[PDB]
Ligand binder design. Structure first.
Ligand SMILES: [Zn+2]
Ligand SMILES: [Zn+2]
Lengths: 684, 685
């Protein structure tokens, strides 16, 4: 099909980002300069009002919208658009002072004072009332303004409250979940252990470092409630948005948890996604760090992109990146010349219809005054950051055909938030080596190196759309999910699972009496022991004429109908099966019993690539470090050839294509400089 | 004026002794008797009494026990000694905490503390201000005219903060004064529009907190300033009766360094506190013989702090505390090796101290510091190596009374700023672990120490014009006013050196807008446009005077105007662009060093400045690295200390002849120094 699917009314790639004139109302000269600089930076879309509550309502019921009126008209006049934010991300001081109930109580049951941001009690009726009301005012005043493009609801939702109100909300939530049956809750959580059985709903409290933290069922269900109540707060926020502005798409900005760029762990975005119109996220890779290559980092970014793109199977919106550096890393090193362009192109390549920044103009003071922005304190255009921002903008202006385009994949990696939660909470294995999302990226690596399109999906997605489904460490899995995987393989799908998959149900309750019969039958084997190793421990697995290094985990395997593809070579399970395959119905299922070195995954997945005919959208010959990614329109392929190394790289096109920017025809060998990106069109 | 002596106390001798706590031994007249005899044998003469003696002075409220202290004053006087009398506010009795809980601190997390420890009173409480002032008054009434009384030791190691509602209100009143009750001004200064933090009533503003607001830099900064001010106010309150009843008695309080790298104490702005004291005094606990640096590097750090604290009031300072052996609270409590105590004491005198004072005289039998070093061990022996080396120091000091009150003018200044330290440390940016501001200053001190060139480490509260060479590294925060002073300084012939991450931010931690401040741009004939922050494994290099020098941590991209390019970067995207610049401005010169460069760079750079400006030691002595030569100057003569801070024999060469202050022997030419040996030498002017 390849039919374009737009997420906003914009038929151009958005460029710009967080704009905060509310910090400059006393500086009209700066405000005027902004418009001209926006034109010079080729930016067109600005996210306004994320923390402007005290600017909009300096005193309770006393409103000041005129500065905002003016910002709307001015941005419209230069041909810009506004992404309007609701301001719930930071309550005014007056509000905390008059309504203390909006201040959080943390898990150690300490009531917080006013300060910071993103930290309201998510249950408080007052904060729900106020936020919905100011949202209603905003939607009334600006809803049909021609500059408006999208709603940016709150900012970076996350965190928890453990106040009395929240305790009660949690009790009600549990009553709904377990159908008011305390026996069912007790059974699910296995509270007979350490005499924790609850005999009244009133007894149940959120987990705490000074209370109860030894009940996994309580811990998991608490995380679930935190997600549901967050989403509830959001719905309450958007009621006036849906009533008065049904024509305006709604998003909220997702995060990656620091360093490894893993999915945000504080909220189940797979559940949140269903409540949004378009997915948006905030990406802050620590480019040029000294513990990994540029390629590894880019590969991680690519993975997160494939995840947030896949949530709604439609273009996503990069809501935030820094055009230079951040303020809050251990080392706030700036992007090198070329790296900003490269990173931006990579966002487009994995499905983004925007390049948006935090921030437009560096705050003169306070916590993020040294966070990167388009415009430095010097107010110069004569700046490498500003110039490279302008170059990205000029490029995007030529890429409007890519807007709304999709990019189907034959390969999916299954990720599961609740599984991540339950696995991290589990007392077992080795705390420091569980590393679930990182492991997923290790299975992503061979496909990234081969430029094979991947979806990172959740159990909410249709499995059958794929030739290959990879589910590492699916430790927590429900019988429903199991049944769907069973169906997937039986109908012809290829399924790969690993060590520490299928241990536990959705209650974190161990599956009893051996492996679940469906898994045992699909895989033609079953795990009987997980061997957890110390850091210096090693094993190896011999596979296709090669011995591959094993660290961290091994699985003793009992064979039923399965073929043994590889074996362990040391320890008490030396020469026992380590890697298996099994024909099940029209499909196949592979078990990888140990954590093996990169080359193992290269060689193992190469076989499935050949067997299942997994190809890149457009083949490009290149060394490691060069990423080729594509987006597909009905009449053409758009292909990004990206040099994520600090060397020149020779690449080869086997087919003629057109440079998207210059029009130039191109085929054969070409040279990319360090961080160079070529964007090409190939006619279909 | 001409090198004239300036005496800080009535003593014409170098104080030797330290904290004396007979209040812990009142049931042991044998120990108190032995104390006096051993005081004679150790040649100690000055003792700090009463530092934690409140509970001994007022065992219950309104019930006093001064007789034991009377006998202490008389007894110490009898054997020819003096008393530094301390006020006891350093630790309140348990009855006081119990009856008046308002004196207990509320920490940053808003937890009320229980009674215990020390140094930890609420600095706002009217009750504690009144009780401490009153007992101070009883003390001055009773001992003020006693001949043994030498100096007041007000409280002990001031430090810490309180966040109780009393303190919140006092902070609010402080802020109203500072900003002229103008909430717009406060909100503008702190940039509170960011994250919707704008305050619409003074009652909303509270101190920063781990469970509240810790993301507003201006609030954090102003809170530290208020902590300093409120501490000083408490001090003034303490000393009211001391001024009334004993105006002729000098007042001090003991300062600290902050652990490991011996950096200036970070808890209080001493450049502000110094103005309130008659004399500066401080407590030195270097971790001698540690396994991570040479004895020479540590000694250099110590000398840096000495230069700082001497320079605060540009007069001799008083070493109030050091250990004659080991301490109790270090991760590794290693004792001084034989000779090291003598050496370190001499170093203290050489950089300006008119005292060698210990903590403590006699080891505590129990509690937290029962294993802290002291002159007298638990065995009460004079046979002790510690006792003997203390005695040797005493014997040496008795021959050194001519050094008392001598000063030591320097032609080189290093500018340090407490508020800059605060603001740079709190800032979100650069790299947390590599900012290392005070350490960096020590890096710039290093070549001058290695050349025995006298250095003042000054604050913006000082006359810049008195120096040839002013070194102000990483002056991230700086006011318009200080900038103007710098400008004048260079214009009238001053030579100024600044570095990366200097002049970024004003006194509100508000970023200077629109490029570098005009005055600085003009002065240096260049401007910084980008600060490159590097990862630990990252490296660069600067080519300068024909050599490559290694760069780590920070680089600065530089735009040239009138300035001469002296050195350039050699790698990364700013390769072959300027890293080191010089610029003539009016009668003076301004140098900018763009990157953080290895030791040898500073050696060569500053060597050139030393030749250029004719920077010399007071007396040249030829020696290898790790021998420190430092001097004090009298009208009639120079007193020169030649100190071997290495663990080996050391050949040293005097070109002019001098007289050994201990033996009278005239010496000249080569001299061998054994390990840790000091030579104290006199040269007639
Ligand atoms: Zn709550
Ligand atoms: Zn207080």
């Amino acid at each position: 099909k390849y039919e374009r699917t737009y997420t906003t009314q914009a038929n151009f790639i958005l460029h710009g980002g967080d704009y905060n004139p509310d910090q400059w109302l006393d500086r009209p000269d700066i405000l005027q300069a902004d418009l001209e600089l926006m034109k010079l930076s080729h930016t067109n879309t600005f996210t306004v009002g994320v923390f402007a509550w005290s600017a909009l309502e300096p005193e309770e019921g006393v409103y000041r919208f005129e500065w905002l009126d003016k910002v709307f008209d001015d941005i419209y006049r230069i041909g810009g658009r506004v992404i309007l934010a609701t301001p719930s991300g930071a309550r005014p001081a007056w509000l905390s002072q008059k309504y203390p109930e909006v201040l959080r109580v943390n898990a150690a049951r300490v009531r917080q004072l006013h300060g910071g941001r993103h930290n309201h009690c998510f249950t408080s009726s007052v904060y729900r009332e106020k936020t919905q009301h100011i949202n209603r005012l905003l939607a009334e005043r600006y809803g049909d303004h021609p500059a408006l493009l999208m709603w940016h609801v709150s900012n970076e939702y996350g965190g928890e409250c453990h106040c009395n109100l929240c305790q009660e909300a949690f009790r009600e939530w549990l009553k709904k979940k377990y159908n008011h049956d305390l026996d069912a809750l007790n059974a699910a959580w296995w509270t007979s252990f350490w005499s924790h059985t609850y005999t009244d709903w009133s007894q149940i409290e959120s987990p705490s470092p000074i209370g109860e933290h030894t009940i996994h069922g309580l811990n998991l269900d608490w995380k679930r409630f935190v997600t549901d109540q967050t989403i509830s707060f959001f719905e309450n926020e958007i009621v006036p948005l849906r009533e008065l502005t049904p024509h305006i798409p709604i998003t909220t900005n997702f995060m990656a948890d620091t360093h490894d760029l893993i999915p945000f762990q504080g909220l189940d975005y797979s559940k949140f996604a269903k409540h949004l119109d378009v997915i948006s996220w905030d990406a802050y890779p620590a480019w040029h760090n000294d513990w990994e290559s540029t390629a590894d980092l880019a590969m991680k970014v690519g993975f997160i992109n494939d995840l947030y793109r896949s949530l709604k199977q439609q273009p996503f919106l990069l809501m935030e990146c820094t055009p230079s550096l951040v303020n809050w890393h251990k080392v706030n090193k700036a992007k090198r010349p070329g790296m900003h362009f490269l990173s931006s192109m990579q966002m487009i390549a994995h499905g983004s219809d925007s390049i948006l920044y935090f921030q437009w103009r560096k705050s003169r003071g306070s916590f993020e005054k040294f966070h990167g922005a388009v415009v430095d304190h010097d107010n110069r255009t004569d700046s490498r950051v500003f110039q490279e921002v302008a170059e990205v903008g000029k490029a995007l202006k030529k890429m409007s055909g890519i807007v709304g385009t999709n990019r189907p994949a034959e390969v999916a990696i299954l990720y599961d938030w609740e599984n991540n939660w339950a696995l991290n909470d589990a007392q077992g294995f080795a705390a420091e080596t569980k590393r679930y999302p990182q492991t997923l990226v290790q299975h992503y690596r061979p496909f990234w190196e081969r430029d094979i399109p991947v979806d990172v999906i959740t159990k909410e997605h249709d499995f059958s759309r794929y030739k290959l489904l990879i589910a590492p460490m699916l430790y927590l899995v429900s019988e429903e999910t199991i049944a769907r995987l069973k169906e997937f393989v039986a109908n012809g799908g290829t399924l790969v699972m690993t060590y520490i998959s299928g241990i536990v149900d959705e209650h974190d309750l161990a599956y009893l009496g051996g492996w679940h019969q469906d898994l045992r039958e699909m895989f033609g084997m079953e795990p009987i022991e997980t061997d957890t190793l110390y850091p210096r421990d090693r094993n190896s697995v011999h596979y296709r004429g090669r011995s591959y290094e094993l660290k961290d985990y091994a699985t003793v395997i009992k064979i039923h109908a399965a073929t043994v593809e590889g074996v362990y070579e040391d320890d008490f399970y030396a020469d026992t099966p380590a890697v298996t395959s099994n024909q099940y119905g029209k499909g196949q299922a592979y078990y990888i019993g140990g954590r093996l070195e990169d080359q193992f995954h290269r060689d193992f997945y190469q076989e499935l690539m050949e067997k299942l005919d997994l190809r890149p959208v457009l083949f490009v010959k290149h060394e490691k470090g060069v990423s080729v990614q594509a987006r597909q329109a009905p009449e053409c392929d758009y292909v990004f050839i990206m040099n994520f190394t600090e060397e020149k790289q020779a690449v080869v096109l086997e087919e003629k294509v057109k440079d998207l920017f210059t029009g130039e025809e191109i085929v054969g060998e070409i040279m990319l400089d360090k961080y160079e990106v070529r964007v090409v069109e190939k006619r279909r």
